[PDB]
Structure formats: C-alpha cells, structure tokens
Design a protein around this ligand. Structure first.
Ligand SMILES: Nc1ncnc2c1ncn2[C@@H]1O[C@H](CSCC[C@H](N)C(=O)O)[C@@H](O)[C@H]1O
Length: 236
C-alpha cells in the first residue's frame, strides 16, 4: 500500500559513496560548535509511542517471550505488556526509574554482565548522546561497548525472531560490522532512520524486517543528509 511502503515515516536511504565515520565526526564537530540558538532551532515514558511506530513498521509481529534490554523507565516493556500481557516480557536495566506496570518481571543487572537466553523478541533501547565538551571518541566507544552487549543475544544458537535494536552511533566501524554480522546470522534486518526523530542525534533502529543490505553506504547517505538538514535549519 501507500502506507506499508515509504519514505513516509522513515527516510529514504539508498547507498552512497563516502566514509561514514569521517562524515559523522564532521557533523558532530559542526554541531558542537553551534550557538545555543542554532542548536535549539535544530533540536510511563515517551518510548512507548516510539516502539509502537517501530512495531507497526514491522507489520505488528507476535512478540511472545520478550527481553527488553536497558529498559529504563519501562515505556517499551509497558507497550509489550499492553499488547500481549505481562507473562512474556522481562525488563533488564540498572536502577531510572521504573514508571511502568509493577507486575512486569524485572532484573536489575548490567546488560554487559548478564548471560543471554533464548527469546522470541529482543528489544534494546540503550545508548546516550554525549555533550559537546568531550572528545568524540568517548561517545563512540561508550555506545560501541553497549552494542557489544547486544551481540551475545544475537549470536546465540537460536537468535531472536523479532528484534528492535537502537543504534545510537551507527557510523562507527564496530556498529557497521555488528549490523552486517547480525544480517548474516539472522538472514534479516534493515537499518532505518525515523522521520521525526531529533536532528540533534544520530539514532537509527535495526529492525527484523526483510533484509536490506549495503548498510555502510546507507549510513553514509544518512549522515550526509543529516548534515544537510542541520545546516538548513540555521538562521537567518
Ligand atoms: N550498562 C547498562 N546496563 C543496564 N542498563 C543500562 C546500562 N546503561 C544504561 N542503562 C539504562 O538504559 C536505559 C535507557 S533509556 C530506555 C528508555 C525505555 N526504552 C523507555 O521507553 O522508557 C537508561 O535508563 C539507563 O539507566
């Protein structure tokens, strides 16, 4: 249909030439130098609605046994509970703080330590944008390490049938390599940029929809496009 397709709710991202790490660092550098005004112009929980959009993009799959990594205040877990009941949903976070249905089973643990188990659905909403005063590599390394935690859940003998994985910094070499590997492991997976996400971040989501390859070139298109739209939204 005109709805099922796009680029209505996600950006159109065809592969393009270029180095996504260099372009990503470039537009991060540009954004760090913006005035308060420029940055403003460009700039149980809200995640609930976010996941709704994402799960609708995936044609509303049956979720079954679900683990929600970095569950935070619980918007995603609450959405799963409303969709299918509290029986199949497990939330993992370091407890900030739980705003969701208290009947949802929760584990207070660091997702980097916890050994994975077999799930039907894998959710991950970890990641943090760093503020301007830091060396760029600190944000890159922090979010890379977080995604590495997701790797063990993806690479187990029976991988998740559904997954929604947030990629905070999609242009690092490790992020791209991980996404390519999960595509080989699962035979699935597409990286999307939500239309209407803030331009002040670089967030994409890896969804278990039909395989879409050439992730590196599409991340390049995404970072170039993002740099353009950040520039556009300037005074005067
Ligand atoms: N290493 C880690 N282990 C477990 N949780 C972590 C973590 N690093 C960050 N987090 C947690 O992950 C959460 C991500 S915010 C996720 C919000 C949630 N999806 C919602 O809709 O409400 C934060 O609350 C943070 O406390």
């Amino acid at each position: 249909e005109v709805y099922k397709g796009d680029g209505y709710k996600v950006w159109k991202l065809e592969p393009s030439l270029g180095d996504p790490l260099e372009l990503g660092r470039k537009t991060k550098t540009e954004m760090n130098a913006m005035t308060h005004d420029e940055f403003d112009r460009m700039k149980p929980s809200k995640g609930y609605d976010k996941l709704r959009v994402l799960l609708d993009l995936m044609d509303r799959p049956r979720l079954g046994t679900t683990v929600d990594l970095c569950a935070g205040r619980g918007g995603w877990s609450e959405l799963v509970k409303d969709l299918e009941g509290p029986k199949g949903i497990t939330a993992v976070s370091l407890w900030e703080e739980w705003m969701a249905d208290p009947a949802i089973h929760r584990i207070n643990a660091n997702v980097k330590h916890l050994r994975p188990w077999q799930v039907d659905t894998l959710l991950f909403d970890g990641g943090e944008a760093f503020k301007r005063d830091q060396n760029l590599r600190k944000e890159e390394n922090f979010n890379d390490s977080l995604l590495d935690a997701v790797d063990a859940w993806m690479m187990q003998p029976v991988p998740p049938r559904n997954f929604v994985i947030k990629i905070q910094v999609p242009y690092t070499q490790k992020a791209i390599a991980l996404l390519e590997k999960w595509q080989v492991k699962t035979g699935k997976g597409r990286l999307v940029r939500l239309a209407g996400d803030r331009l002040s971040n670089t967030v994409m989501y890896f969804l278990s929809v039909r395989l879409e390859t050439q992730i590196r070139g599409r991340v390049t298109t995404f970072v170039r496009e993002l740099a353009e739209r950040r520039k556009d939204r300037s005074l005067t």
